[PDB]
Amino acid sequence: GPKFPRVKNWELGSITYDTLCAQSQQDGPCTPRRCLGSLVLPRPAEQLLSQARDFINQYYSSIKRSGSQAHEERLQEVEAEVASTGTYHLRESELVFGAKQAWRNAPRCVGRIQWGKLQVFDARDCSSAQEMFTYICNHIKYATNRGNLRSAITVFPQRAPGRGDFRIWNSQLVRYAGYRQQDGSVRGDPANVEITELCIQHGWTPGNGRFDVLPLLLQAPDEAPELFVLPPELVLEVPLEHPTLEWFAALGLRWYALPAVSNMLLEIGGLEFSAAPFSGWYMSTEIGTRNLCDPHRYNILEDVAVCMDLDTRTTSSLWKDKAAVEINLAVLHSFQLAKVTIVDHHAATVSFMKHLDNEQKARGGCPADWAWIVPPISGSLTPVFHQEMVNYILSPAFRYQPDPW
Amino acid sequence: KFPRVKNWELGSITYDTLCAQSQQDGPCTPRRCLGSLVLPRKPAEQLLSQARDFINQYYSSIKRSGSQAHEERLQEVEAEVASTGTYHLRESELVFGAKQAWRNAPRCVGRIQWGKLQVFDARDCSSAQEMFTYICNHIKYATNRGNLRSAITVFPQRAPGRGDFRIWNSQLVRYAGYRQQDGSVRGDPANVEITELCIQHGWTPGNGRFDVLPLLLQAPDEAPELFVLPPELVLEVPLEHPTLEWFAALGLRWYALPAVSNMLLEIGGLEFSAAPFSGWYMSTEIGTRNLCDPHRYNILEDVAVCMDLDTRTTSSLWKDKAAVEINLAVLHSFQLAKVTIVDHHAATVSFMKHLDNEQKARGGCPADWAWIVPPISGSLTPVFHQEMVNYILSPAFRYQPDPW
């Protein structure tokens, strides 16, 4: 029938067709012979120009002024800037529309119903590492908002031909130290071993606990990274307790409130923003399931299971399933007590379904990656598990970029 | 050309070379991934090469590639197809192909078992009656008093100049679904269509929540025929919880034997439209989907209420707590009953070993991440952290349209 992908919700028996995917200009890793859908990492003037033109059209289209003479003048202006410099600049409003669109387009983000509510800080005037720190602090302050979390993004100056990038070396703005121990093991977050060591190499005196908030290594073009300690009263944290299990608080576990991804590259109409930290609010499973329970992270399942006096000798006692659920409950209860925005995976996925319906009307489709959308506990208990999804790459986009060291 | 395949828990890396043996196209293009689609919307010369390829695979397996016997058999197949437009499999080749199609099923977390499969040759069959006898012997052997054994029974291939042998039921054991006055369903709502078919063709029905359906079996170009399974043939496991006494008051049971009967078996271009197969259950299938899905037995909320859980808000995780307990009732019960079952932790661990065995034997293993990762506690198992390449290899199992 309709010459477009047919997508079905198996739980409601409803069907849709994706026409959005025709607007895709960049290929992913699948072919007709094999799907590489599960791999984490995918893989001059002419090229830039056509990306810019395309972006400008999305912009003018979004303000229902497509085919306008303001529209036309703008296209000319951009293509003049490039023929003489090899690049162009985005006006304020265009940058705001581009960063919202790059979020909206992110296939692995379950939080997109919020896409329209993003507070965009233009730091394209920033010119030093000390100044990057001020912008980042102001970002944390506004985003945190004493627990009532607000989505934000700070956009530092774009990449320029033959000139080093603005970079944030840290993968998030708040990260716990991971200290590799004499005896082979790790204290704190095993995921941050590399970055912790970088900080020490750069003259940070490390602490010694499981939840030591790392300083920031920030880099201005062609200069060495400089080191900044976030003032702890800016870094809001939540000590973890359980609603009925009294001993849980005695575990001494905590998590920070603000999820601020700082390593991704932001692409708008062919322009490339190497430094553009963004934050929203956590889904409980990210903390309660991945950060605390992954075997290669804090790995606490067994310690919790032993406090719950479960039989850890056999898989079939479902000790891992029971301990995980209770860890996730703790996380939710602890944020709600502390009055810090957080969302549970049932609510999140429910809102994602509603987002899917909005986007069908608005654009004809929604690029979505099933394996990242579906939560890491209770998958089939969430409506997104039963929903077929089409994955494809739209621009503007967040991308992974190489570590700058 | 040979994709890199990383495990993110342990950082180990492998390369998949087997993918190049794929001859069938999936749903994906460079433009868009369509790997999450459940089903696809996706002349005698297409056959000859498919048969040649298969006869090669088989001789390769018995280390006689290039023998007199292999070249001899090759020509014989080429002859039979040039004379008749079809051909026949030697039994030991059928045995090999049926295992190979299990081996190649990308969606199956149970493939470490692939080598142990009892194949019944049921190609001497000319009636539904004979179909039924074979099915009863299958079930008996497979169930083996609770100590389950994987098996497949293969019925005669499709022929161009006639209708197929078919088993109408999608599984050999199914719980009836009755349409009630108020529009509600007594029993299992997934089997309403087939319940009504059984009735329409003569069956006098029951009115419990777990009535075992009769079989509708079909020989070529003939009305289907009704066959009641003798109760003692169908091993059932009553459901109870180890610590929660009221669970048993729910009156739940599940059957011991998962026996899929609606799939088409493809071997060297030959098609066996009736070839039912059974293994044993992973506990999540019963404890999560069959009991917890709202379109099925939909017991989640009942169970949570009895757990005394706050059912008003998502954030209490009542759904998550109840499912775990239900899944646990399933394991406990099968273990109490002494019936073979595997939990999702043990199953996904055996699968990780499968991948390693297949890497060494064949240079990879096609796998469907979304189906291999279980439907609860996904990241808790090791397959979650494992990258996977998906592609269609032959021999294969595939879907076919319902015969009505």
Ligand code: HEM
């Ligand atoms: C406000 C609440 C938000 C929630 C609840 C949320 C949730 C999530 C989750 C759970 C993931 C996958 C996480 C993982 O497993 O690593 C994700 C991915 C992602 N999020 Fe959102 N997010 C939110 C806000 C934002 C914002 C403001 C942005 C950017 C403006 C954003 C951009 C992205 C991107 C680009 C990815 C994909 C990462 C990748 O490609 O690997 N998110 N989100």
Ligand code: HEM
């Ligand atoms: C012996 C223990 C076995 C276990 C634990 C097992 C487990 C599973 C599971 C959990 C699925 C997912 C399907 C679903 O969630 O609905 C599956 C799919 C599948 N199984 Fe296995 N299985 C076993 C034996 C077998 C046998 C004996 C065969 C045939 C010889 C087989 C063939 C398949 C095929 C072809 C699929 C894919 C179904 C599809 O395309 O949707 N399995 N299996």
Ligand SMILES: Cc1cc(N)nc(CCc2cccc(CCc3cc(C)nc(N)c3)n2)c1
């Ligand atoms: C805003 C926001 C909201 C929220 N609730 N959670 C997060 C953290 C999860 C996340 C969201 C987006 C991007 C990344 C990390 C990007 C990344 C980069 C590389 C190089 N490898 C990866 N595996 C991941 N992580 C961010």
Ligand SMILES: Cc1cc(N)nc(CCc2cccc(CCc3cc(C)nc(N)c3)n2)c1
């Ligand atoms: C052997 C076996 C072992 C085991 N542990 N679980 C099962 C049940 C799950 C399963 C395994 C293989 C094939 C199918 C049938 C899938 C299907 C397809 C279509 C198109 N409609 C359906 N109703 C069902 N189901 C079977």
Ligand SMILES: C[C@H](O)[C@H](O)[C@H]1CNc2nc(N)[nH]c(=O)c2N1
């Ligand atoms: C191998 C697999 O693709 C990889 O581990 C993915 C699976 N799904 C995920 N989903 C989310 N949200 N986050 C993740 O880190 C992952 N990991």
Ligand SMILES: C[C@H](O)[C@H](O)[C@H]1CNc2nc(N)[nH]c(=O)c2N1
């Ligand atoms: C739409 C979605 O892909 C679909 O419901 C799949 C997802 N993964 C699954 N995985 C298993 N094991 N069984 C299933 O039925 C499904 N359903």
Ligand SMILES: [Zn+2]
């Ligand atoms: Zn794909």
Ligand SMILES: [Zn+2]
């Ligand atoms: Zn359903």
